[PDB]
Amino acid sequence: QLTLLGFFAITASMVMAVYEYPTFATSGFSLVFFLLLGGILWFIPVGLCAAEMATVDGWGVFAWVSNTLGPRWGFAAISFGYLQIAIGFIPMLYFVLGALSYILKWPALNEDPITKTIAALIILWALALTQFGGTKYTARIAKVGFFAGILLPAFILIALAAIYLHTFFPDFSKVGTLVVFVAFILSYMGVEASATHVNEMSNPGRDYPLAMLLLMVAAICLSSVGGLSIAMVIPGNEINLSAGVMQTFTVLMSHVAPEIEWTVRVISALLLLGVLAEIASWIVGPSRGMYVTAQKNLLPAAFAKMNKNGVPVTLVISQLVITSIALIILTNTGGGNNMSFLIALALTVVIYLCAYFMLFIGYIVLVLKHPDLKRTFNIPGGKGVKLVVAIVGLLTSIMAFIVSFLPPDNIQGDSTDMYVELLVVSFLVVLALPFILYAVHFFLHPRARSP
């Protein structure tokens, strides 16, 4: 037994969505909207399903998809639930280079490559150096890191703007006004990894749907307070997606900022600190979460050298040649460092959404082709609902997947739009990977833990 609060903790890691906060505003008041959307129609469904599956087959997503549609399809599923990190990184690096932008006093970081790119490279392979040593540290660095440079900086911001005080349907009649959904959905991605912890938990029954209900509620009013702050003190036209946050800060200080327009570059210090902590954790966590295959049938060829103190290697390194290539290539084509942030968002998103499609379809299949029956856990409405919910998830997922491809004329006026050309060729060369190969703490993010 572990109580509803228990789940709402051990996984609560992901209620904070800062890196994403900048872009949420560009929706304007309609950002409360996308959050209810993502939560009801995707978050809760992805949860509910991945749960009922994690409880008897059983025991990651590799297991569940593998059980329901074979070895190949499962394996790929995991490989996307890994590559989506090997890239999901980039937005963070931009947010890093952004916070450093409001410190070392240098816009050259948040605007002008190659500097943005080469600085990212240095931060990234430097974090690599600090992890290769072994992961004795990481998880707690990030404990007091999530603590110092994320809870605090927000509460500072939440309270601050709240003092500055003294579902507006999106507009589908203007074009590109849907792509932003990417980030909202990217906010909820990861829950599966912490679905298993429903055994370590008792009375699953009707209860975990409340941890979920809540978790969603929280992450909504939570990821939307800091959304609305930026949003309605900075005209949703020139919000930089990398900066954005600290931008909101500097101009917010202007109101009880007697030279105190200085505490702001400190606040930045704390931010880049927290994010640096997480990113550190992700240099090894996921990479490790997908050795299960090196182990099974020797699926990945010789792709294994596990030494110490951890720890994998080729996997980490080529996660870094991936991420570094995604960085160099994606940082230097198109409407510059804003289309870059957004596109890297979205491409991370589709790569992962693959695995989500597989999850959902393999859940329909567990339901109908395997009702016999088992399960320490079960979605309510017998099976009418079991299904209708799994197909609702599947659906929003597919939305997110296409809509990831309809960019407006310009995101924050960048914007040349050699976009879909790039998002597509990219996601293709990636989606190819997992298939080509097969043929031959509760403080760090769920997308990234390990079991």
Swiss-Prot record:
Q: What induces it?
A: By acidic conditions. Expression is regulated by a complex system involving RpoS, cAMP, CRP, EvgAS, H-NS, GadE, GadW and GadX. The level of involvement for each regulator varies depending upon the growth phase and the medium.
Q: What is the regulatory mechanism acting on its activity?
A: Shows pH-dependent activity. The Glu/GABA transport activity is robust at pH 4.5 and rapidly decreases with increasing pH, with no detectable activity at pH 6.5 or above. The Glu analog L-trans-pyrrolidine-2,4-dicarboxylic acid (L-PDC) blocks the uptake of glutamate by selective inhibition.
Keyword flag Transport: yes
Activity dependence on pH, as recorded: Inactive at pH 6.5 or above.
The topology of this chain with respect to the membrane is: Multi-pass membrane protein
GO cellular component terms, alphabetically, are: plasma membrane
> What result is annotated for mutating W282A?
At least 90% decrease in substrate transport
MF terms in GO: antiporter activity
> What subcellular locations does the record give?
Cell inner membrane
Summarize the record's disruption phenotype note: Mutant shows a 10-fold decrease in resistance with glutamate.
Subunit details: Monomer.
Q: State the family it belongs to.
A: Belongs to the amino acid-polyamine-organocation (APC) superfamily. Glutamate:GABA antiporter (GGA) (TC 2.A.3.7) family.
Name of this protein: Glutamate/gamma-aminobutyrate antiporter
The species this protein belongs to is Escherichia coli (strain K12)
